[PDB]
Write a protein that binds this ligand. Structure first.
Ligand SMILES: [Ca+2]
Length: 485
Protein backbone atom coordinates (compact mmCIF):
# COMPACT_ATOMS: atom_id res chain seq x y z
CA UNK A 1 0.00 0.00 0.00
CA UNK A 2 2.25 2.79 1.26
CA UNK A 3 0.58 6.19 1.24
CA UNK A 4 -2.87 4.57 1.41
CA UNK A 5 -2.41 3.26 4.96
CA UNK A 6 -3.46 6.71 6.22
CA UNK A 7 -2.41 10.33 6.77
CA UNK A 8 -3.67 11.68 10.08
CA UNK A 9 -5.34 14.95 10.95
CA UNK A 10 -5.42 16.06 14.58
CA UNK A 11 -8.40 18.37 15.05
CA UNK A 12 -8.99 18.35 18.81
CA UNK A 13 -7.08 17.60 22.00
CA UNK A 14 -8.60 16.72 25.37
CA UNK A 15 -6.43 16.75 28.48
CA UNK A 16 -7.48 15.28 31.84
CA UNK A 17 -5.46 16.08 34.97
CA UNK A 18 -6.31 13.55 37.65
CA UNK A 19 -5.16 14.04 41.24
CA UNK A 20 -3.79 10.92 42.91
CA UNK A 21 -4.34 9.44 46.37
CA UNK A 22 -8.10 9.32 46.84
CA UNK A 23 -11.37 11.16 46.21
CA UNK A 24 -10.97 14.53 44.53
CA UNK A 25 -11.62 16.85 41.61
CA UNK A 26 -10.48 16.15 38.06
CA UNK A 27 -9.42 19.17 35.99
CA UNK A 28 -10.18 18.78 32.28
CA UNK A 29 -9.35 20.88 29.24
CA UNK A 30 -11.51 19.27 26.56
CA UNK A 31 -11.77 19.69 22.81
CA UNK A 32 -8.94 22.17 22.50
CA UNK A 33 -8.33 23.31 18.94
CA UNK A 34 -5.15 21.50 17.92
CA UNK A 35 -3.65 24.31 15.83
CA UNK A 36 -4.06 26.82 18.64
CA UNK A 37 -2.39 24.71 21.33
CA UNK A 38 0.14 22.51 19.50
CA UNK A 39 2.92 22.60 16.91
CA UNK A 40 2.61 20.36 13.88
CA UNK A 41 3.73 16.77 14.49
CA UNK A 42 7.38 15.80 14.19
CA UNK A 43 8.37 12.19 13.66
CA UNK A 44 10.82 10.38 15.92
CA UNK A 45 12.76 8.32 13.33
CA UNK A 46 13.69 5.75 15.99
CA UNK A 47 10.15 4.93 17.15
CA UNK A 48 8.16 6.11 14.12
CA UNK A 49 5.88 7.92 16.61
CA UNK A 50 4.77 11.50 16.05
CA UNK A 51 5.41 14.02 18.83
CA UNK A 52 2.98 16.87 19.55
CA UNK A 53 4.72 19.81 21.23
CA UNK A 54 2.58 22.47 22.96
CA UNK A 55 2.64 26.13 21.84
CA UNK A 56 0.27 27.53 24.43
CA UNK A 57 -0.09 26.60 28.07
CA UNK A 58 -3.33 25.16 29.43
CA UNK A 59 -4.64 26.61 32.69
CA UNK A 60 -4.21 24.08 35.50
CA UNK A 61 -6.74 25.70 37.84
CA UNK A 62 -7.57 23.55 40.87
CA UNK A 63 -4.87 20.96 40.10
CA UNK A 64 -2.05 23.41 40.95
CA UNK A 65 0.22 21.96 43.64
CA UNK A 66 -1.25 18.46 43.33
CA UNK A 67 0.31 15.19 42.27
CA UNK A 68 -1.60 14.17 39.17
CA UNK A 69 -1.55 11.78 36.26
CA UNK A 70 -2.48 13.09 32.83
CA UNK A 71 -4.77 11.31 30.37
CA UNK A 72 -5.31 12.36 26.75
CA UNK A 73 -8.01 11.83 24.14
CA UNK A 74 -7.32 13.13 20.63
CA UNK A 75 -10.17 13.65 18.16
CA UNK A 76 -13.12 12.89 20.48
CA UNK A 77 -15.24 13.66 17.40
CA UNK A 78 -18.31 11.72 18.59
CA UNK A 79 -18.17 13.17 22.13
CA UNK A 80 -17.90 9.69 23.61
CA UNK A 81 -14.97 10.34 25.97
CA UNK A 82 -16.41 13.64 27.19
CA UNK A 83 -19.74 12.00 27.94
CA UNK A 84 -18.25 8.96 29.69
CA UNK A 85 -15.85 11.01 31.83
CA UNK A 86 -18.22 13.83 32.83
CA UNK A 87 -18.34 14.43 36.59
CA UNK A 88 -16.20 11.39 37.28
CA UNK A 89 -14.33 11.63 40.58
CA UNK A 90 -10.54 11.47 40.49
CA UNK A 91 -10.70 8.23 42.50
CA UNK A 92 -12.89 6.60 39.82
CA UNK A 93 -11.19 8.04 36.77
CA UNK A 94 -8.56 5.40 35.95
CA UNK A 95 -11.22 2.65 35.99
CA UNK A 96 -13.69 4.83 34.06
CA UNK A 97 -11.11 5.47 31.33
CA UNK A 98 -11.28 1.70 30.65
CA UNK A 99 -15.08 1.41 30.73
CA UNK A 100 -17.28 0.91 27.67
CA UNK A 101 -18.43 3.43 25.08
CA UNK A 102 -21.23 2.70 22.62
CA UNK A 103 -20.69 3.80 19.02
CA UNK A 104 -23.84 2.17 17.62
CA UNK A 105 -26.92 1.03 19.49
CA UNK A 106 -28.15 -2.53 19.00
CA UNK A 107 -30.77 -1.06 16.60
CA UNK A 108 -28.13 0.90 14.68
CA UNK A 109 -25.99 -2.24 14.31
CA UNK A 110 -28.46 -3.50 11.70
CA UNK A 111 -29.06 -1.65 8.45
CA UNK A 112 -31.49 -2.12 5.57
CA UNK A 113 -31.47 -1.38 1.82
CA UNK A 114 -32.53 2.24 2.40
CA UNK A 115 -29.28 2.81 4.35
CA UNK A 116 -27.04 2.04 1.36
CA UNK A 117 -24.74 2.95 -0.24
CA UNK A 118 -23.24 5.02 2.60
CA UNK A 119 -24.45 3.59 5.91
CA UNK A 120 -23.29 4.95 9.20
CA UNK A 121 -21.06 2.32 10.81
CA UNK A 122 -19.93 2.16 14.41
CA UNK A 123 -16.25 2.69 13.62
CA UNK A 124 -16.93 5.40 11.05
CA UNK A 125 -18.38 7.60 13.76
CA UNK A 126 -14.90 8.00 15.28
CA UNK A 127 -12.80 7.62 12.15
CA UNK A 128 -13.54 9.99 9.29
CA UNK A 129 -12.05 10.28 5.84
CA UNK A 130 -11.73 13.93 4.91
CA UNK A 131 -12.08 13.77 1.14
CA UNK A 132 -8.88 12.12 -0.10
CA UNK A 133 -6.63 14.45 1.89
CA UNK A 134 -6.37 12.92 5.36
CA UNK A 135 -8.28 11.19 8.15
CA UNK A 136 -9.54 12.21 11.58
CA UNK A 137 -9.39 9.30 14.03
CA UNK A 138 -10.08 9.18 17.77
CA UNK A 139 -7.12 8.24 19.95
CA UNK A 140 -6.76 7.44 23.66
CA UNK A 141 -3.91 6.53 26.01
CA UNK A 142 -3.42 2.91 27.08
CA UNK A 143 -1.73 4.34 30.13
CA UNK A 144 -1.57 7.87 31.49
CA UNK A 145 1.55 9.94 32.18
CA UNK A 146 3.77 9.13 35.11
CA UNK A 147 2.73 10.96 38.26
CA UNK A 148 3.86 14.58 38.36
CA UNK A 149 3.37 17.68 40.48
CA UNK A 150 1.96 20.82 38.89
CA UNK A 151 3.57 24.12 39.98
CA UNK A 152 5.57 15.02 30.82
CA UNK A 153 4.41 12.76 27.98
CA UNK A 154 1.31 10.72 27.12
CA UNK A 155 1.22 8.18 24.30
CA UNK A 156 -2.06 7.55 22.51
CA UNK A 157 -3.26 4.95 20.06
CA UNK A 158 -6.06 5.01 17.52
CA UNK A 159 -9.43 3.67 18.59
CA UNK A 160 -10.10 1.75 15.37
CA UNK A 161 -8.50 -0.93 13.27
CA UNK A 162 -8.29 -0.67 9.47
CA UNK A 163 -9.03 -3.40 6.95
CA UNK A 164 -7.45 -3.16 3.48
CA UNK A 165 -8.09 -5.63 0.63
CA UNK A 166 -6.26 -6.12 -2.67
CA UNK A 167 -6.38 -8.69 -5.47
CA UNK A 168 -3.82 -10.15 -7.86
CA UNK A 169 -6.26 -9.82 -10.76
CA UNK A 170 -9.76 -8.50 -11.37
CA UNK A 171 -10.77 -11.77 -13.08
CA UNK A 172 -10.09 -15.41 -12.24
CA UNK A 173 -10.47 -18.54 -14.32
CA UNK A 174 -12.08 -21.45 -12.43
CA UNK A 175 -11.19 -25.04 -13.32
CA UNK A 176 -13.32 -28.08 -12.61
CA UNK A 177 -11.79 -30.59 -10.19
CA UNK A 178 -14.28 -33.31 -11.15
CA UNK A 179 -16.70 -33.94 -14.06
CA UNK A 180 -19.25 -31.11 -14.17
CA UNK A 181 -21.69 -31.63 -17.03
CA UNK A 182 -19.52 -31.71 -20.16
CA UNK A 183 -16.56 -30.07 -18.38
CA UNK A 184 -13.85 -32.57 -17.50
CA UNK A 185 -11.59 -32.30 -14.47
CA UNK A 186 -8.86 -29.80 -15.33
CA UNK A 187 -10.92 -27.88 -17.90
CA UNK A 188 -12.25 -24.36 -17.49
CA UNK A 189 -15.59 -24.31 -15.69
CA UNK A 190 -16.26 -20.61 -15.16
CA UNK A 191 -14.85 -17.10 -14.91
CA UNK A 192 -15.16 -14.86 -11.86
CA UNK A 193 -15.43 -11.10 -12.49
CA UNK A 194 -16.59 -7.90 -10.77
CA UNK A 195 -15.05 -8.52 -7.37
CA UNK A 196 -16.27 -6.38 -4.46
CA UNK A 197 -16.01 -6.30 -0.67
CA UNK A 198 -17.49 -5.18 2.60
CA UNK A 199 -16.52 -5.74 6.24
CA UNK A 200 -18.75 -6.78 9.12
CA UNK A 201 -18.84 -8.10 12.67
CA UNK A 202 -16.44 -5.66 14.13
CA UNK A 203 -17.90 -4.58 17.47
CA UNK A 204 -20.41 -1.80 18.06
CA UNK A 205 -19.00 -0.90 21.52
CA UNK A 206 -15.42 -0.75 22.83
CA UNK A 207 -13.42 -0.13 25.98
CA UNK A 208 -12.53 3.55 25.78
CA UNK A 209 -8.84 2.69 26.05
CA UNK A 210 -7.34 -0.79 25.58
CA UNK A 211 -8.11 -3.22 28.41
CA UNK A 212 -5.76 -6.05 29.33
CA UNK A 213 -7.28 -9.49 29.95
CA UNK A 214 -6.30 -12.02 32.61
CA UNK A 215 -5.03 -14.97 30.52
CA UNK A 216 -2.35 -15.28 27.83
CA UNK A 217 -4.82 -16.59 25.23
CA UNK A 218 -6.39 -13.13 24.99
CA UNK A 219 -4.03 -10.26 25.65
CA UNK A 220 -6.61 -7.49 25.14
CA UNK A 221 -10.29 -8.06 25.81
CA UNK A 222 -13.28 -6.46 24.08
CA UNK A 223 -16.91 -6.18 25.25
CA UNK A 224 -17.85 -9.19 23.14
CA UNK A 225 -14.90 -11.46 24.03
CA UNK A 226 -16.95 -13.78 26.22
CA UNK A 227 -19.71 -14.27 23.65
CA UNK A 228 -19.49 -17.69 21.96
CA UNK A 229 -22.57 -18.15 19.76
CA UNK A 230 -24.58 -21.28 19.13
CA UNK A 231 -26.67 -21.63 15.99
CA UNK A 232 -29.59 -20.20 17.97
CA UNK A 233 -28.00 -17.60 20.27
CA UNK A 234 -26.28 -15.98 17.27
CA UNK A 235 -29.60 -14.72 15.99
CA UNK A 236 -30.92 -13.56 19.34
CA UNK A 237 -27.73 -12.02 20.77
CA UNK A 238 -25.10 -11.15 18.14
CA UNK A 239 -26.30 -7.54 17.79
CA UNK A 240 -25.60 -7.06 21.51
CA UNK A 241 -21.97 -7.01 20.40
CA UNK A 242 -21.40 -6.63 16.66
CA UNK A 243 -22.01 -4.13 13.85
CA UNK A 244 -23.51 -5.28 10.52
CA UNK A 245 -24.52 -1.93 9.05
CA UNK A 246 -21.45 -2.01 6.82
CA UNK A 247 -22.86 -4.90 4.78
CA UNK A 248 -24.77 -2.18 2.87
CA UNK A 249 -21.70 -0.15 1.84
CA UNK A 250 -21.78 0.48 -1.91
CA UNK A 251 -24.88 -1.66 -2.15
CA UNK A 252 -26.61 -1.81 -5.54
CA UNK A 253 -30.35 -2.55 -5.78
CA UNK A 254 -29.90 -4.18 -9.19
CA UNK A 255 -29.39 -7.88 -8.40
CA UNK A 256 -27.67 -8.32 -11.79
CA UNK A 257 -24.85 -6.20 -10.40
CA UNK A 258 -22.38 -7.12 -7.64
CA UNK A 259 -22.70 -5.00 -4.46
CA UNK A 260 -19.83 -3.63 -2.40
CA UNK A 261 -16.62 -1.69 -2.69
CA UNK A 262 -14.09 -2.28 -5.48
CA UNK A 263 -11.06 -4.37 -4.67
CA UNK A 264 -7.90 -2.68 -5.96
CA UNK A 265 -4.92 -4.42 -7.55
CA UNK A 266 -1.43 -3.96 -6.09
CA UNK A 267 -0.68 -1.72 -9.07
CA UNK A 268 -3.58 0.58 -8.15
CA UNK A 269 -1.78 1.38 -4.91
CA UNK A 270 1.12 2.75 -7.01
CA UNK A 271 -1.01 5.05 -9.19
CA UNK A 272 -0.55 8.79 -8.71
CA UNK A 273 -3.72 10.90 -8.46
CA UNK A 274 -6.71 8.57 -8.30
CA UNK A 275 -10.48 8.91 -8.85
CA UNK A 276 -12.53 9.61 -5.73
CA UNK A 277 -14.16 6.18 -5.80
CA UNK A 278 -10.93 4.24 -6.21
CA UNK A 279 -9.28 6.42 -3.55
CA UNK A 280 -12.00 5.33 -1.12
CA UNK A 281 -11.42 1.68 -1.96
CA UNK A 282 -7.65 2.08 -1.60
CA UNK A 283 -7.88 3.58 1.90
CA UNK A 284 -9.91 0.62 3.16
CA UNK A 285 -12.47 0.40 5.94
CA UNK A 286 -12.47 0.99 9.67
CA UNK A 287 -13.82 -1.36 12.32
CA UNK A 288 -13.84 -1.57 16.11
CA UNK A 289 -11.76 -4.21 17.90
CA UNK A 290 -12.96 -7.76 18.35
CA UNK A 291 -11.04 -10.42 20.28
CA UNK A 292 -11.68 -13.81 21.88
CA UNK A 293 -9.77 -16.51 23.71
CA UNK A 294 -7.32 -18.05 21.23
CA UNK A 295 -6.86 -21.84 21.01
CA UNK A 296 -5.07 -24.54 19.00
CA UNK A 297 -8.25 -26.22 17.79
CA UNK A 298 -12.00 -25.83 17.41
CA UNK A 299 -12.72 -26.89 20.98
CA UNK A 300 -10.22 -24.58 22.67
CA UNK A 301 -10.67 -21.51 20.45
CA UNK A 302 -13.54 -19.12 21.20
CA UNK A 303 -13.34 -17.64 17.70
CA UNK A 304 -16.49 -18.63 15.80
CA UNK A 305 -17.87 -17.54 12.43
CA UNK A 306 -20.65 -15.77 14.32
CA UNK A 307 -18.40 -13.67 16.58
CA UNK A 308 -15.32 -12.85 14.48
CA UNK A 309 -14.80 -9.83 12.19
CA UNK A 310 -14.87 -10.75 8.50
CA UNK A 311 -14.34 -9.38 5.05
CA UNK A 312 -17.12 -10.56 2.74
CA UNK A 313 -15.97 -10.82 -0.88
CA UNK A 314 -18.72 -10.76 -3.49
CA UNK A 315 -18.28 -11.53 -7.19
CA UNK A 316 -19.95 -12.65 -10.43
CA UNK A 317 -19.54 -16.36 -11.28
CA UNK A 318 -20.26 -17.03 -14.99
CA UNK A 319 -20.28 -20.76 -15.70
CA UNK A 320 -19.90 -22.23 -19.16
CA UNK A 321 -23.24 -23.39 -20.51
CA UNK A 322 -21.63 -26.76 -21.20
CA UNK A 323 -21.17 -27.25 -17.45
CA UNK A 324 -24.90 -27.85 -17.07
CA UNK A 325 -25.82 -31.53 -16.81
CA UNK A 326 -29.36 -30.76 -18.00
CA UNK A 327 -28.13 -29.21 -21.27
CA UNK A 328 -29.79 -30.47 -24.45
CA UNK A 329 -32.12 -32.78 -22.55
CA UNK A 330 -35.88 -33.14 -22.36
CA UNK A 331 -37.88 -32.87 -19.14
CA UNK A 332 -40.18 -35.65 -17.94
CA UNK A 333 -43.10 -33.46 -19.11
CA UNK A 334 -41.64 -33.63 -22.65
CA UNK A 335 -40.57 -29.98 -22.81
CA UNK A 336 -36.98 -29.06 -23.72
CA UNK A 337 -34.44 -27.89 -21.15
CA UNK A 338 -33.34 -24.34 -22.02
CA UNK A 339 -29.64 -23.51 -22.35
CA UNK A 340 -28.14 -21.50 -19.52
CA UNK A 341 -28.08 -17.76 -20.23
CA UNK A 342 -25.02 -15.94 -18.88
CA UNK A 343 -25.81 -13.82 -15.86
CA UNK A 344 -29.02 -15.65 -14.97
CA UNK A 345 -29.69 -17.62 -11.80
CA UNK A 346 -28.15 -21.05 -11.65
CA UNK A 347 -28.65 -23.97 -9.27
CA UNK A 348 -25.97 -26.24 -7.87
CA UNK A 349 -27.23 -29.52 -6.51
CA UNK A 350 -26.02 -31.41 -3.48
CA UNK A 351 -24.22 -33.52 -6.11
CA UNK A 352 -22.18 -30.54 -7.28
CA UNK A 353 -23.85 -30.47 -10.71
CA UNK A 354 -25.23 -27.33 -12.39
CA UNK A 355 -28.90 -26.90 -13.36
CA UNK A 356 -30.84 -24.05 -15.00
CA UNK A 357 -33.83 -24.42 -12.67
CA UNK A 358 -35.17 -26.29 -9.66
CA UNK A 359 -37.32 -28.20 -12.15
CA UNK A 360 -34.06 -29.61 -13.56
CA UNK A 361 -32.53 -30.24 -10.14
CA UNK A 362 -35.14 -32.88 -9.24
CA UNK A 363 -35.94 -34.40 -12.69
CA UNK A 364 -33.92 -37.59 -13.29
CA UNK A 365 -34.63 -37.46 -17.05
CA UNK A 366 -32.28 -34.46 -17.29
CA UNK A 367 -29.67 -35.57 -14.73
CA UNK A 368 -31.48 -34.28 -11.67
CA UNK A 369 -32.30 -36.32 -8.58
CA UNK A 370 -35.72 -36.52 -6.94
CA UNK A 371 -35.68 -34.91 -3.49
CA UNK A 372 -32.25 -33.40 -3.98
CA UNK A 373 -31.65 -29.85 -2.75
CA UNK A 374 -29.72 -27.09 -4.49
CA UNK A 375 -28.13 -23.71 -3.85
CA UNK A 376 -29.59 -20.94 -5.98
CA UNK A 377 -26.90 -18.47 -7.09
CA UNK A 378 -28.83 -15.29 -7.71
CA UNK A 379 -27.77 -13.86 -11.08
CA UNK A 380 -24.48 -15.66 -10.48
CA UNK A 381 -23.56 -13.89 -7.19
CA UNK A 382 -20.93 -15.78 -5.18
CA UNK A 383 -19.65 -14.99 -1.69
CA UNK A 384 -16.40 -15.68 0.17
CA UNK A 385 -15.13 -14.99 3.70
CA UNK A 386 -11.71 -13.69 4.62
CA UNK A 387 -10.69 -13.42 8.26
CA UNK A 388 -8.63 -10.34 9.11
CA UNK A 389 -5.88 -11.81 11.18
CA UNK A 390 -5.54 -15.56 10.78
CA UNK A 391 -3.35 -16.71 13.66
CA UNK A 392 -1.46 -18.56 12.37
CA UNK A 393 -1.91 -19.21 8.63
CA UNK A 394 -3.00 -20.65 6.27
CA UNK A 395 -5.86 -23.01 5.31
CA UNK A 396 -7.37 -25.40 7.87
CA UNK A 397 -5.31 -24.06 10.79
CA UNK A 398 -6.14 -20.38 11.33
CA UNK A 399 -8.24 -21.04 14.45
CA UNK A 400 -7.90 -17.45 15.70
CA UNK A 401 -8.44 -13.94 14.32
CA UNK A 402 -8.06 -11.12 16.86
CA UNK A 403 -8.65 -7.55 15.71
CA UNK A 404 -6.88 -4.96 17.89
CA UNK A 405 -7.09 -1.17 17.61
CA UNK A 406 -4.30 0.79 15.90
CA UNK A 407 -3.46 -2.05 13.53
CA UNK A 408 -4.00 -2.41 9.80
CA UNK A 409 -5.07 -5.79 8.47
CA UNK A 410 -4.22 -6.17 4.81
CA UNK A 411 -5.81 -9.10 2.99
CA UNK A 412 -4.35 -9.87 -0.44
CA UNK A 413 -6.34 -12.18 -2.70
CA UNK A 414 -3.96 -14.29 -4.81
CA UNK A 415 -6.72 -16.35 -6.40
CA UNK A 416 -10.34 -17.34 -6.13
CA UNK A 417 -10.25 -21.11 -6.69
CA UNK A 418 -13.81 -22.37 -6.75
CA UNK A 419 -17.50 -21.68 -6.46
CA UNK A 420 -18.35 -19.76 -3.27
CA UNK A 421 -21.55 -19.46 -1.23
CA UNK A 422 -24.90 -18.17 -2.52
CA UNK A 423 -25.87 -16.26 0.66
CA UNK A 424 -24.41 -14.99 3.94
CA UNK A 425 -25.63 -16.84 7.07
CA UNK A 426 -23.35 -14.72 9.28
CA UNK A 427 -25.94 -12.00 9.77
CA UNK A 428 -28.52 -12.14 12.58
CA UNK A 429 -32.04 -12.87 11.34
CA UNK A 430 -34.80 -11.36 13.53
CA UNK A 431 -37.12 -14.18 12.42
CA UNK A 432 -34.84 -17.18 11.74
CA UNK A 433 -37.83 -19.44 10.93
CA UNK A 434 -38.10 -17.79 7.52
CA UNK A 435 -35.51 -16.86 4.91
CA UNK A 436 -36.53 -13.19 4.61
CA UNK A 437 -34.09 -10.85 6.36
CA UNK A 438 -34.21 -7.14 5.46
CA UNK A 439 -31.04 -6.62 7.49
CA UNK A 440 -29.04 -8.85 5.12
CA UNK A 441 -28.12 -7.86 1.56
CA UNK A 442 -27.43 -11.56 0.91
CA UNK A 443 -30.39 -13.44 2.43
CA UNK A 444 -31.18 -17.12 1.88
CA UNK A 445 -32.71 -17.65 -1.61
CA UNK A 446 -33.11 -21.40 -1.22
CA UNK A 447 -36.07 -23.69 -0.74
CA UNK A 448 -36.86 -25.10 2.72
CA UNK A 449 -34.56 -27.83 3.99
CA UNK A 450 -31.60 -26.84 1.82
CA UNK A 451 -28.33 -27.38 3.75
CA UNK A 452 -26.81 -24.13 5.02
CA UNK A 453 -23.50 -23.10 3.41
CA UNK A 454 -21.96 -22.27 6.80
CA UNK A 455 -23.13 -21.65 10.38
CA UNK A 456 -22.29 -19.01 13.01
CA UNK A 457 -21.37 -21.68 15.59
CA UNK A 458 -18.65 -23.09 13.30
CA UNK A 459 -14.90 -22.49 13.77
CA UNK A 460 -12.99 -20.23 11.38
CA UNK A 461 -10.89 -22.49 9.16
CA UNK A 462 -11.98 -24.24 5.93
CA UNK A 463 -11.06 -27.87 5.22
CA UNK A 464 -10.33 -26.91 1.60
CA UNK A 465 -9.88 -23.25 0.67
CA UNK A 466 -12.12 -21.18 -1.58
CA UNK A 467 -9.53 -18.41 -1.94
CA UNK A 468 -5.77 -18.18 -1.77
CA UNK A 469 -4.89 -15.17 0.42
CA UNK A 470 -1.99 -13.68 2.34
CA UNK A 471 -2.62 -11.44 5.31
CA UNK A 472 -0.19 -8.82 6.57
CA UNK A 473 -0.66 -6.95 9.87
CA UNK A 474 1.02 -3.59 10.02
CA UNK A 475 1.04 -0.37 12.04
CA UNK A 476 0.06 3.02 10.69
CA UNK A 477 3.04 4.85 9.17
CA UNK A 478 3.00 6.95 12.32
CA UNK A 479 2.70 4.17 14.90
CA UNK A 480 1.38 6.22 17.82
CA UNK A 481 1.21 9.88 18.87
CA UNK A 482 3.11 11.21 21.82
CA UNK A 483 1.54 14.24 23.48
CA UNK A 484 4.02 16.41 25.38
CA UNK A 485 2.73 18.60 28.17
CA1 LIG B 1 -36.13 -14.39 8.60
Amino acid sequence: PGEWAGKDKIEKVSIYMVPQGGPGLVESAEDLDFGTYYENPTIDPATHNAILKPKKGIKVNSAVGKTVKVYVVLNDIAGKAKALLANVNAADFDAKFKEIIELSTQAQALGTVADGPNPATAAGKIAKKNGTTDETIMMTCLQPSDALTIEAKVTVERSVARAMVSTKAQSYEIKATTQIGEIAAGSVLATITDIRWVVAQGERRQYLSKKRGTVPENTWVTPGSGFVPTSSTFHTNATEYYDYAGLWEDHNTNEAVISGTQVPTLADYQLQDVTGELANALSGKFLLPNTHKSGANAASSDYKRGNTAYVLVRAKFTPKKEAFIDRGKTYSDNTAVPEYVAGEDFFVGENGQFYVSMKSVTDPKVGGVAGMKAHKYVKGKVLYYAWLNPSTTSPDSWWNSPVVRNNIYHIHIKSIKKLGFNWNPLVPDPDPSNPENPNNPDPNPDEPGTPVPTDPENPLPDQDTFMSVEVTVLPWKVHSYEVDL
